[PDB]
Amino acid sequence: IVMGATNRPNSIDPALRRFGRFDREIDIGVPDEIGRLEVLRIHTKNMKLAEDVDLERISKDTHGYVGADLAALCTEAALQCIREKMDVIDLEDDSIDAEILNSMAVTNEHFHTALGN
Amino acid sequence: PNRLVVDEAINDDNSVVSLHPATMEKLQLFRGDTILIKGKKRKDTVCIALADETCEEPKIRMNKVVRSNLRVRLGDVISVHQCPDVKYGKRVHILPVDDTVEGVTGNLFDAYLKPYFLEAYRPVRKGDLFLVRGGMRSVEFKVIETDPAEYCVVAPDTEIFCEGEPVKREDEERLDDVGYDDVGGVRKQMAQIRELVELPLRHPQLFKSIGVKPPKGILLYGPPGSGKTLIARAVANETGAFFFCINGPEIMSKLAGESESNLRKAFEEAEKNAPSIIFIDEIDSIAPKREKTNGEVERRIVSQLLTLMDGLKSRAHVIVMGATNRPNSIDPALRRFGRFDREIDIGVPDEIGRLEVLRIHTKNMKLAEDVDLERISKDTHGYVGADLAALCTEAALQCIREKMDVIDLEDDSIDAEILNSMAVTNEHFHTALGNSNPSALRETVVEVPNVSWNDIGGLENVKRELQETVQYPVEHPEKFEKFGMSPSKGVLFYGPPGCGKTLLAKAIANECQANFISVKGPELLTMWFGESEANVREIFDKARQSAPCVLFFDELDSIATQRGGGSGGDGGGAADRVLNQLLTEMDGMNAKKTVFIIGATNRPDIIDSALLRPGRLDQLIYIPLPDEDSRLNIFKAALRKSPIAKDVDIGALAKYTQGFSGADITEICQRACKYAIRENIEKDIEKEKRRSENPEAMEEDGVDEVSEIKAAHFEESMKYARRSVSDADIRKYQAFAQTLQQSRGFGSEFRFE
């Protein structure tokens, strides 16, 4: 079985879409609100999310966002949390306290900021 | 407490540094002890710490040699740490400089280093440099290696070896490697890049604990010569990472097959030396936008770059800073997730940015004490950093101009006194600016205009309306969410020409500290005629990234008139490429985004109705001609900079000059100044005539009549006063305002039981 892949069916040469070569076609379209919710839950499962995180709000406010964009949003939120956590952590020190590392965790406002950016 | 500012030291000894006594006590440092000092580029050195009461508590005093060793200059902050582990060197390898040894016979070690280190117990670190005085000459020496392999104190029993090749001075000068301080105008972008890059490379443990994937792809687009290549080197050198630079032209100039080999070797070596940084300078040549795919080599290289970017991994500790002029010029396939996700805009520097760039480029030159760089920065608009460096070079060249007459060209030798007497002057900078040319003038400038409500004359109703529609949703949006209703995402200004609509927009932007973007209809019209309609989406994108923002579409009716609007340009309406794209982008804007858009039109009866539909630009506000107080405000603003004769108070004139637009006010002032100006020059010409009559008559100390702008010349100017707008145009405007108003009936007839 040969699963092709592309962006739009018209971008492919028609000769490939004749019977025998590539007959079935499937549309992996933009995920819906529920789809965005599952994608966010999948990408954020391994991270240290806060107890006040409201992923449903992010899913509702995310329209036109593909899964990769959602992962980028999560990464941006973590980066913003680091932002807030830079002042205490000295950059010139090759070693960083483990307590601060264990204390890091994203917050809903960080997600809001990342979505804004 | 261990960080101190670098300062000049009283002692010139290379291996001795001075610290404030209480500061040493806080660090538990005693006089004569060996201390490890960390400077820039992760370069540290070892010096003998001495107590100096004259040194300020937050300052550390040290000479030029240690400054070079630490790669820091005056004003830089360095860290001092206890180094009680410095062991007496068993063997130290130090070599001289190639140019400093010419004319010296014998063993340079015995002449200079042997007495310099014997019984001095001077700490030495690998790569350290110092100057030793002996035999009437000063010879530079560089430390090659130390027995501990980190640093040691050279004792009398230490065996110092100087058998090796001399060190080249030109190559040694590279040690002044670029840091964050050598760039300017990119403070915010500098922070973004420093974070996104230095954090994972220096402290990946943070991301690992948070379980996130640090970005690999960074794209720095902007104007040519803005300093892109310097930022990456500064970042890499500050993080201590291995930097490998790739230039698009260099890669594309290689023979087929060799470019791919070089690229793969670059990636492979970069991954070997992790943490590493890769700069694909001018990625446009490597991967230009697919407008036409001609040939096979170009496709091969672009696809090779794509697959190489995809194949790289987060654990590899590799970051790829691209570079280009405009993001659209790059092939979209590169901007997909995984390859090049983050994008940064190294835009034109602002006034402060221009100031820092000028101070950076002119620090090494012999500037005069009367140089006013702030004036140059203020007068330099649209100038990129490279243009500023060119301006400085032109100013120096002009100083040379003034200095040519004395210096004979045919003489192979030139006096040293004249050379030491050269120095640029502010007037030279003015001349260079007059001769120079900006490189960036059509690029959308994003900044916070300084116009304030005080500059806005009256218009209390419109002031209130626009503050309502804009100021609140950007100053108090959280409570808008609290109630939650959608805010207005647009507004349209219709009014007479030359009534200060752009001033109003800029003032409202400043009140909210929100960025203002000025886009005129002619520019979009030209770009569409240039078949570059993607510029419109680019404007919308930029306005979005720099939120909060106020996108001001100047002469919105220009496009409609080009198509016709309501006057009947073509047989029908006004919609076209640019207009339709504008509507499409308008309906596609994010409700949560603080991108407010303002449209200005001098002709409301010709604007396409589709643009006025709710959801795109619906709020319509009328801007009347300035009234008595508004006209007074405009008058004083125009004459605010100029002196006026005491006999003339401009409010009296403003009172009776109804029906006259702000442009007419500006021109009345221009003509009044102009007539007073003719008066001044006529007086000067009469003075010159009198002096010609009596050239030898010594000019007495007669108080020169104060050259002011008097009321007679205001009379002469108003004799040529204009009123561009007639009462018929205002009648049309109020007819539109009435067709809009249609408010009556329930003003007071409604009340609940």
PDB file of C-alpha atoms in Angstrom, chain A residues 46-48 57 61 68-69 71-72 74-76 78-79 81-83 86 89-96 101-102 104-106 116-117, chain B residues 3 38-39 42 81 192 194-196 198-199 202-203 205-215 238 337 341-342 544-545 590 592-593:
ATOM      1  CA  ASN A  46       4.961  15.237  28.828  1.00  0.00           C
ATOM      2  CA  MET A  47       5.324  18.821  30.100  1.00  0.00           C
ATOM      3  CA  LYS A  48       4.855  20.101  33.655  1.00  0.00           C
ATOM      4  CA  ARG A  57     -10.036  27.982  26.432  1.00  0.00           C
ATOM      5  CA  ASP A  61      -9.485  30.658  20.926  1.00  0.00           C
ATOM      6  CA  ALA A  68       2.237  21.847  14.351  1.00  0.00           C
ATOM      7  CA  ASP A  69       1.198  25.407  15.168  1.00  0.00           C
ATOM      8  CA  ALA A  71       2.993  22.418  19.335  1.00  0.00           C
ATOM      9  CA  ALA A  72       4.797  25.662  18.522  1.00  0.00           C
ATOM     10  CA  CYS A  74       3.100  25.112  23.620  1.00  0.00           C
ATOM     11  CA  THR A  75       6.835  25.589  23.097  1.00  0.00           C
ATOM     12  CA  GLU A  76       6.369  29.367  23.078  1.00  0.00           C
ATOM     13  CA  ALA A  78       7.209  27.174  27.970  1.00  0.00           C
ATOM     14  CA  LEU A  79       9.718  29.697  26.644  1.00  0.00           C
ATOM     15  CA  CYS A  81       7.650  30.683  31.531  1.00  0.00           C
ATOM     16  CA  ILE A  82      11.434  30.527  31.227  1.00  0.00           C
ATOM     17  CA  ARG A  83      11.296  34.265  30.550  1.00  0.00           C
ATOM     18  CA  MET A  86      15.336  33.987  34.080  1.00  0.00           C
ATOM     19  CA  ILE A  89      18.814  31.900  37.330  1.00  0.00           C
ATOM     20  CA  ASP A  90      22.243  33.391  36.643  1.00  0.00           C
ATOM     21  CA  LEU A  91      23.361  32.772  33.069  1.00  0.00           C
ATOM     22  CA  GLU A  92      27.113  32.833  33.739  1.00  0.00           C
ATOM     23  CA  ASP A  93      26.823  29.924  36.201  1.00  0.00           C
ATOM     24  CA  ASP A  94      27.428  26.589  34.478  1.00  0.00           C
ATOM     25  CA  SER A  95      25.297  24.912  37.173  1.00  0.00           C
ATOM     26  CA  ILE A  96      21.712  25.794  38.084  1.00  0.00           C
ATOM     27  CA  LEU A 101      14.230  23.499  37.850  1.00  0.00           C
ATOM     28  CA  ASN A 102      11.641  21.396  39.682  1.00  0.00           C
ATOM     29  CA  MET A 104       9.160  25.475  36.782  1.00  0.00           C
ATOM     30  CA  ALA A 105       5.727  24.906  35.271  1.00  0.00           C
ATOM     31  CA  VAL A 106       3.692  26.629  32.574  1.00  0.00           C
ATOM     32  CA  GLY A 116      -0.784  36.386  21.356  1.00  0.00           C
ATOM     33  CA  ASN A 117       2.733  36.052  19.949  1.00  0.00           C
TER      34      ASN A 117
ATOM     35  CA  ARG B   3      30.545  41.603  39.858  1.00  0.00           C
ATOM     36  CA  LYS B  38      35.931  36.057  34.234  1.00  0.00           C
ATOM     37  CA  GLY B  39      35.233  38.551  31.465  1.00  0.00           C
ATOM     38  CA  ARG B  42      33.765  33.184  28.531  1.00  0.00           C
ATOM     39  CA  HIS B  81      36.219  34.521  42.146  1.00  0.00           C
ATOM     40  CA  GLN B 192      14.698  37.506  21.458  1.00  0.00           C
ATOM     41  CA  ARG B 194      19.826  35.790  22.884  1.00  0.00           C
ATOM     42  CA  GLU B 195      17.006  33.963  24.640  1.00  0.00           C
ATOM     43  CA  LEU B 196      16.054  31.602  21.800  1.00  0.00           C
ATOM     44  CA  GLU B 198      21.847  31.004  24.210  1.00  0.00           C
ATOM     45  CA  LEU B 199      19.281  29.431  26.563  1.00  0.00           C
ATOM     46  CA  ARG B 202      24.040  26.973  27.711  1.00  0.00           C
ATOM     47  CA  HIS B 203      21.195  25.598  29.875  1.00  0.00           C
ATOM     48  CA  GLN B 205      18.559  21.205  31.319  1.00  0.00           C
ATOM     49  CA  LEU B 206      15.756  23.745  31.747  1.00  0.00           C
ATOM     50  CA  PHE B 207      14.061  22.696  28.511  1.00  0.00           C
ATOM     51  CA  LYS B 208      14.674  19.019  29.263  1.00  0.00           C
ATOM     52  CA  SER B 209      13.044  19.343  32.691  1.00  0.00           C
ATOM     53  CA  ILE B 210      10.115  21.246  31.211  1.00  0.00           C
ATOM     54  CA  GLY B 211      10.175  18.634  28.443  1.00  0.00           C
ATOM     55  CA  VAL B 212      10.073  21.065  25.521  1.00  0.00           C
ATOM     56  CA  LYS B 213      11.870  21.069  22.189  1.00  0.00           C
ATOM     57  CA  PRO B 214      14.053  24.171  21.726  1.00  0.00           C
ATOM     58  CA  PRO B 215      13.721  25.658  18.234  1.00  0.00           C
ATOM     59  CA  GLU B 238      29.145  35.194  24.113  1.00  0.00           C
ATOM     60  CA  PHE B 337       7.222  23.433  10.868  1.00  0.00           C
ATOM     61  CA  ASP B 341       9.601  28.135  12.535  1.00  0.00           C
ATOM     62  CA  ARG B 342      10.636  31.286  14.404  1.00  0.00           C
ATOM     63  CA  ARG B 544      -0.277  41.937  13.506  1.00  0.00           C
ATOM     64  CA  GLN B 545       3.177  41.026  14.832  1.00  0.00           C
ATOM     65  CA  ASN B 590      -8.422  37.875  14.773  1.00  0.00           C
ATOM     66  CA  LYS B 592      -8.603  38.786  20.171  1.00  0.00           C
ATOM     67  CA  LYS B 593      -5.780  40.654  18.415  1.00  0.00           C
TER      68      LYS B 593
END
